[PDB]
Amino acid sequence: VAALVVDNGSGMCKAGFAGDDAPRAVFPSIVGRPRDSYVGDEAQSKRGILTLKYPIEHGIVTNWDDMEKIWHHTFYNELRVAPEEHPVLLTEAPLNPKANREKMTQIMFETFNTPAMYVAIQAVLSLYASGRTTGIVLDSGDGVSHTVPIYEGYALPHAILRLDLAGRDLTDYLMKILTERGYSFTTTEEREIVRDIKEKLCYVALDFEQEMATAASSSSLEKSYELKDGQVITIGNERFRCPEALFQPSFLGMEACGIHETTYNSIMKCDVDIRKDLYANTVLSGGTTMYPGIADRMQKEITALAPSTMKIKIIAPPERKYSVWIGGSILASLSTFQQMWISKQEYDESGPSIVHRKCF
Ligand SMILES: Nc1ncnc2c1ncn2[C@@H]1O[C@H](COP(=O)(O)OP(=O)(O)OP(=O)(O)O)[C@@H](O)[C@H]1O
Ligand SMILES: [Ca+2]
Structure with a gap:
């Protein structure tokens, strides 16, 4: 039988089967609760009646109750599998605190009864x-x-x-500078529209100063975008000023x-x-x-x-x-990896701190 590959991020979660060339389910890392609980796409759509939480901040798990809810949703609703039937490869941030690795390990074995698991760096x-x-x-x-x-x-x-400084910061920055052109994107549903604009039209300039001069002397770099109700907007130097913040954190007020x-x-x-x-x-x-x-x-x-x-x-x-997901799928598929797993018998004997010597 196949192992499962789970990659949890700050914004999106990716999951599927070891050996496939792509994940089968991709959804937002959001947990919603009345102002009894909703996860992923359903949580975002029903966000009007709910209080929303993001259990993963800058790659690190900060809320363990909610992280468990995401994992239950991943197994039972998205992949439609029984955890106790499959070995499970999980992913973690670089420099993940020692205590976090242990708790991760404890939940898989004691809450979901996985026969085997492993954790690797993204x-x-x-x-x-x-x-x-x-x-x-x-x-x-x-x-x-x-x-x-x-x-x-x-x-x-x-x-x-x-x-x-990453994608979430760039989306917010694009909302800001589009206003200084006369448009008004400010609400939570408008944030999602601007995220689409960013992903379709933005690009990194080779020489920033020269690109700014090209945009100021003609309309050669302009592109259009059609909104749901049929309004067409136009974007110029905003196309490359947005991702320029990755190269100059000054744009966002950071000394970095x-x-x-x-x-x-x-x-x-x-x-x-x-x-x-x-x-x-x-x-x-x-x-x-x-x-x-x-x-x-x-x-x-x-x-x-x-x-x-x-x-x-x-x-x-x-x-x-x-x-990240494809790398996990490759690894959990190699027959020469099969004796690398942490078994439940090993867990039963050593407890959660076995992870430091098994997943090194
Ligand atoms: N074609 C694209 N161009 C630019 N940005 C994109 C594109 N497609 C997706 N993004 C952005 O990438 C981000 C999602 O990437 P990814 O799934 O690697 O992050 P994550 O794992 O959720 O978060 P992190 O690694 O920071 O914990 C979003 O901010 C999204 O807007
Ligand atoms: Ca990630």
């Missing part, structure tokens, strides 16, 4: 999906961006960096290095003898890395920071929106 799974075991991954989702150096299958914790400088800073924290492997194997993952033009801009910026003789290669896989 960024490591993405690297695997690209057929590599050495490289540095930039993972940018809905709530957090990480840069993660990896060597022979092992993430290097001393060199991992965290930036709390951009995603290009963060990647270089992580590499510089690693042993001199491995840096060249990392420079030549920089991989992009997550929904927020989907912008057209993002790989060429990363290439340009890293080149200006690195030594002049250095070989720079940015890899941006076409399926990178789901490369």
Whole structure:
């Protein structure tokens, strides 16, 4: 029988069967409750009568009651399976606190009675999906961006960096600057419309200053978008100013290095003898890395920071929106992985802290 692959994020949850090339269910990480409980799409649609919670903040689980409700929904409503029948691979953020790993483990075995489980780092799974075991991954989702150096299958914790600027922040920023053109997007249902605008029309400029000058001298960069009621709006320099905040956190009032400088800073924290492997194997993952033009801009910026003789290669896989899930599916499918699982007998004997020596 097949193992199950579950990838829980700040914005979206992805789940399915080990061996498939895509997840079977993708839904919002939202739990709703009367002002008895609703999860996912139903919670968002019925949001008028409900109080909404987001159990995962910047990649870290903060509310365990609600996280359990998401897992019950994932098994019984979305995949339509019995947890006690299947081994279960779960995913976690880089630098997930020790206590969080243990509680995760406790709930699978004691609440859902899984015969087996395992937990792997999100960024490591993405690297695997690209057929590599050495490289540095930039993972940018809905709530957090990480840069993660990896060597022979092992993430290097001393060199991992965290930036709390991602897709959710970009959506809000686009709402703001579209107003300064005369439009008025402010409500929760309007936020969802602007999220669509962002995903369809936005892009990363190669040279920001020059792109600003092009937009100010003609309408060559303008694009249109039709709203539900038939109104057509027009967007110009907003198309590239929005994702520019990833490269300049100043735009949002943050005193922080951009995603290009963060990647270089992580590499510089690693042993001199491995840096060249990392420079030549920089991989992009997550929904927020989907912008057209993002790989060429990363290439340009890293080149200006690195030594002049250095070989720079940015890899941006076409399926990178789901490369965490696909990496898990690959791993849980390998017959040479089957003796890596934590069994329930092992749990019964050692308890939740067995996870530190089994999932290393
Ligand atoms: N084509 C696209 N262009 C730009 N942004 C996109 C695109 N598709 C999705 N996104 C954005 O990516 C985000 C979702 O990505 P992902 O599922 O990787 O994050 P997550 O796992 O929910 O969150 P995190 O990893 O931060 O915990 C959303 O903010 C969404 O608006
Ligand atoms: Ca994620």
